Amino acid sequence: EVVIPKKKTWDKVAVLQALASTVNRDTTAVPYVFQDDPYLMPASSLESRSFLLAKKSGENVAKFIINSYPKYFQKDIAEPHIPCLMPEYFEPQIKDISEAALKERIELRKVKASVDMF
Amino acid sequence: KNRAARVRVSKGDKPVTYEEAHAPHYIAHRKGWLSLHTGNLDGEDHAAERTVEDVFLRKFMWGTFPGCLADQLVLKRRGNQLEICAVVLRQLSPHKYYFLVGYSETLLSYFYKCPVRLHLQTVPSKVVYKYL
Amino acid sequence: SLWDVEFAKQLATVNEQPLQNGFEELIQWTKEGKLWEFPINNEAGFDDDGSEFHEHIFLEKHLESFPKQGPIRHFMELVTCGLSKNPYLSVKQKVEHIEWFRNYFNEK
Amino acid sequence: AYQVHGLLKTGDNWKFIGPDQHRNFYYSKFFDLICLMEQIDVTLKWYEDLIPSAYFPHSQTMIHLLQALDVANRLEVIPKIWKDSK
Amino acid sequence: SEYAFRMSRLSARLFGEVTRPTNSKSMKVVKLFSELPLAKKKETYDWYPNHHTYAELMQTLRFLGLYRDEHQDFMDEQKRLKKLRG
Amino acid sequence: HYVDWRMWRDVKRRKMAYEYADERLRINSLRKNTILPKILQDVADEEIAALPRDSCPVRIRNRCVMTSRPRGVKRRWRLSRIVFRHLADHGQLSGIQRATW
Amino acid sequence: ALPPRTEKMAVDQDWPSVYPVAAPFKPSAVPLPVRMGYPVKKGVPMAKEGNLELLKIPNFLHLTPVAIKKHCEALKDFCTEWPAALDSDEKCEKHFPIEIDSTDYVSSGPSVRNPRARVVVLRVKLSSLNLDDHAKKKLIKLVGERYCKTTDVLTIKTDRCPLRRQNYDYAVYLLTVLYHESWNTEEWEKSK
Amino acid sequence: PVVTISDEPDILYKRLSVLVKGHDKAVLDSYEYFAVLAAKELGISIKVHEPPRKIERFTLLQSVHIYKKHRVQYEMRTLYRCLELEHLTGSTADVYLEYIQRNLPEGVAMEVTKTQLEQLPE
Ligand SMILES: [Mg+2]
């Protein structure tokens, strides 16, 4: 007789969640969002906030230049496809006066353009 | 004479690091490799574009971190996390440092389509291994 | 509609918290899709529309038999064996090759 | 305060802490309370457990540290917390 | 013999290669349709980087001021002096 | 914005050969099968002889991936001799040592 | 700059808490004056705070035995146990006859496309198939190029279809149709 | 700790053998000690093996224009270390594989895993 067990199934997340439960918080270390260099430590809460807002500033820096120039990045190399690494196109690709273009600029959140072509 | 990657002795007043000081025949006897990617072993396919992206990365980080990189980077590559680990100096302000880290983080993640992580390491002055 | 997706995104913003650990960085990268799926089978995605082993190598159904004693049918057997032994091409480009030969042979 | 902190440590209420300003106010007043009516050994234990891992303390929190240490008459800890403040 | 020939034919029909006896000069057509041609290989059509995304992206980033490349600095200064005197 | 006109000519070769690969594949299988009649192969001879002389994989020269040099290229990184020597001597290339056996 | 957590850090401190992830060296985080380098003639190995060689070391400072012990205290949930299939190879062959090769090749970069990783090949034992006499004669006469004599192992190869699961399907399909055509008696068997 | 024991009996992996290829014997045997201790506290059976190293040697010219008689020779050291697992579960297999591929080393590592799921004939 073989007591062959049925395979219990998980997602991609539970192993790393158990790993974090192994690594509870470090009572002597700074939050991981900041770096680990003593020169790059925030000393005060205001300095930490300035560091964080500078980092979010750089994030939307790359977001702005990427969405301004989507041609330089259309080549995907990663598989499977990552739509949140694909460019977000903010210009209306539908130019004729149509309801498809109406839904298009409604999705693109262009209020004056939607009103004008309505 | 051989001068592939050997810095020549000027007069005894020339600051130089370990990597620039050591010759290419000490490349795995004393130095190690500045980029760790898996393309160069027995069975692999994509090592050519690994190399072209390696030189792209070196020139790009040098162009976008102007005059603050002490010596050459460490370009590590495991799975799909790229690691640019840096030895950056302590001259420019940390707001600029975090700004360029986020800028580079996002653009290289976006250009190579993976998790790309830059880990800075701040050094006061460019370190001297010997004076030649 | 947009009210429920707005409620979803505002719920996301008010449950957005600092990363505070590299394991949580890996968590968010798995959630977005940046990190690879693991354990990896070298065949993540790439379903090939559920071809399931007969459309790749058994090409009678797209062969559409002519008089089988002919050299044209012999060429069909040869190209059918070749397209069966292709692993890099799928059934759709196999049958468009087959239809290209059908079209050209009907042209002649 | 301890019972709310225990409810915090249950599960993802640390995620329910929320933003950085709310977290700073949270831990600042919590540690002010700890310095106000706890004994000095567990105030120092909470000091090393929370600062600077959880938050960056304020100047009012600093003068309350000094008041707590003066009440406890443990003036030997003054140089260490001084170096920490600097 | 004849039996061995028809066992080879039966194995060919069973496994998927060509059933009827055919010479190497069309068995080669079967290999041609079994492998990819010289032009369709991934390294063949991706041997070169396109260089246009690369160079024009560095161009755009430099004239946005996010990139500082000393080679282009050299050509700018040298052509400034060359238009000054030439 | 390519290295030279020779490199740009080569990438023209690569791109449009990769486009015009399938028809050439069908008709050169029609060359070197020995079943069809000879004139029925001669009309096919006409079609490939009319197919353009820039997509045939006979013009594909494996030049160096950084700097155009026809002869002296290692395929495994598409690098020329002295560029590969430069890089694997500065030590930015993992696993390449100096062969001393 | 600031005085670091290297000397702020004190003994009996949890190191899985210190280093969760595989990270590069970070000497300020490292509480260890680790020295690299070929020393100069009248000097010492180069110090810790700035070494690119310390950085280039693959850095197995995220994994020590007590950390892996605690990691698999967490990871011990994700496992069953085996039946009494025994360490005996003949016993597990009796219980489960067929054997199949179905692999993966782990690369590291942008993409995980190693096409050869779809290779699948099936090995089965005639002595475990137990139902072949002139069928086993017909079987060998079909598959001549395999079936080495010294061990009764039948090895059928598939690398013809792009996906691993349909390669497994080709393996099992070839096994069952070779079995059925072996048991299908043909009319010209007698004139051997 | 979500678990979700779902429906179907085990895939019955016998001999999951991991060939670890590297440029660096120190990385290979540190990873060996790591995997051996992890397997020991897991309870699965681990065996060690050292396939012989392969050295890819090749030759280039040294000067740019002339002097073929003075050549440079470069080499690659590809060392192999085998960690074969016998008698490990499918769930234990993919959790152990998941752990060791999270903590797989960098460019000095490949993890070629050979899985022999057993099954019944049909
Ligand atoms: Mg010489």
From Swiss-Prot, chain A:
Protein role: Mitochondrial RNA-binding protein that has a role in mitochondrial translation.
| Summary of subunit composition and partner proteins | Component of the mitochondrial small ribosomal subunit (mt-SSU). Mature mammalian 55S mitochondrial ribosomes consist of a small (28S) and a large (39S) subunit. The 28S small subunit contains a 12S ribosomal RNA (12S mt-rRNA) and 30 different proteins. The 39S large subunit contains a 16S rRNA (16S mt-rRNA), a copy of mitochondrial valine transfer RNA (mt-tRNA(Val)), which plays an integral structural role, and 52 different proteins. Associated with the 12S mitochondrial rRNA (12S mt-rRNA).
User: Which tissues and organs express this gene's product?
Assistant: Abundant in testes, skeletal muscle and heart tissue.
Describe the family membership recorded for this protein in Swiss-Prot or TrEMBL. Answer: Belongs to the mitochondrion-specific ribosomal protein mS39 family.
Native organism: Homo sapiens
The name on file for this protein is Small ribosomal subunit protein mS39
**Spans of repeat PPR:** 94-118
Gene this protein is translated from: PTCD3
The cellular location(s) given in this protein's UniProt record come to: Mitochondrion
Q: Where on the chain is N6-acetyllysine found, per UniProt?
A: K71
Q: What range of the full-length protein does this chain span?
A: 56 to 173 of 689
Swiss-Prot record, chain C:
Does the record bear Ribonucleoprotein in its keywords? yes
Predominant cellular place of this UniProt entry's protein: mitochondrion
Q: Which keywords does this Swiss-Prot/TrEMBL entry list? A: Mitochondrion, Ribonucleoprotein, Ribosomal protein, Transit peptide
Q: GO annotations under biological process?
A: mitochondrial translation
GO cellular component terms attached to this protein's record: mitochondrial inner membrane; mitochondrial small ribosomal subunit; mitochondrion; nucleolus
* Localization terms from the record: Mitochondrion
Q: What's a single GO MF annotation on this record?
A: RNA binding
Q: Does the keyword Mitochondrion apply?
A: yes
| Family per record | Belongs to the mitochondrion-specific ribosomal protein mS31 family.
Q: How does it assemble?
A: Component of the mitochondrial small ribosomal subunit (mt-SSU). Mature mammalian 55S mitochondrial ribosomes consist of a small (28S) and a large (39S) subunit. The 28S small subunit contains a 12S ribosomal RNA (12S mt-rRNA) and 30 different proteins. The 39S large subunit contains a 16S rRNA (16S mt-rRNA), a copy of mitochondrial valine transfer RNA (mt-tRNA(Val)), which plays an integral structural role, and 52 different proteins.
Q: What is this protein called?
A: Small ribosomal subunit protein mS31
Q: Which residues of the full protein are shown?
A: 276 to 383 of 395
UniProtKB/Swiss-Prot annotation, chain E:
**GO terms, biological process:** mitochondrial translation; translation
Q: Where in the cell is it found?
A: Mitochondrion
**Record's keyword terms, sorted:** Acetylation, Mitochondrion, Ribonucleoprotein, Ribosomal protein
Primary site of residence: mitochondrion
CC annotations in GO: mitochondrial inner membrane; mitochondrial small ribosomal subunit; mitochondrion
Q: Which domain of life is it from?
A: Eukaryota
Chain intervals with Basic residues compositional bias: 80-86
Q: Name one GO molecular function term.
A: structural constituent of ribosome
The subunit structure is: Component of the mitochondrial small ribosomal subunit (mt-SSU). Mature mammalian 55S mitochondrial ribosomes consist of a small (28S) and a large (39S) subunit. The 28S small subunit contains a 12S ribosomal RNA (12S mt-rRNA) and 30 different proteins. The 39S large subunit contains a 16S rRNA (16S mt-rRNA), a copy of mitochondrial valine transfer RNA (mt-tRNA(Val)), which plays an integral structural role, and 52 different proteins.
Give the similarity note: Belongs to the mitochondrion-specific ribosomal protein mS33 family.
Instruction: From the Swiss-Prot or TrEMBL record, give the protein name.
Output: Small ribosomal subunit protein mS33
This chain is encoded by the gene named: MRPS33
* Included stretch of the parent chain: 5 to 90 of 106
Swiss-Prot record, chain H:
Where does the protein principally reside?
mitochondrion
Subcellular localization is given as:
Mitochondrion
Kindly state which keywords UniProt assigns to this record, in alphabetical order.
Mitochondrion, Ribonucleoprotein, Ribosomal protein
Tell me the Gene Ontology biological-process terms attached to this UniProt entry. mitochondrial translation
Q: Name one GO cellular component term.
A: mitochondrial matrix
- Family indicated by similarity: Belongs to the universal ribosomal protein uS10 family.
Share what the entry says about its subunit structure, partners included.
Component of the mitochondrial small ribosomal subunit (mt-SSU). Mature mammalian 55S mitochondrial ribosomes consist of a small (28S) and a large (39S) subunit. The 28S small subunit contains a 12S ribosomal RNA (12S mt-rRNA) and 30 different proteins. The 39S large subunit contains a 16S rRNA (16S mt-rRNA), a copy of mitochondrial valine transfer RNA (mt-tRNA(Val)), which plays an integral structural role, and 52 different proteins.
Q: What is this protein called?
A: Small ribosomal subunit protein uS10m
What organism, scientifically named, is this protein from? Homo sapiens
List the lineage, top down.
Answer: Eukaryota, Metazoa, Chordata, Craniata, Vertebrata
Q: State which gene encodes it.
A: MRPS10
Q: Which residues of the full protein are shown?
A: 61 to 182 of 201
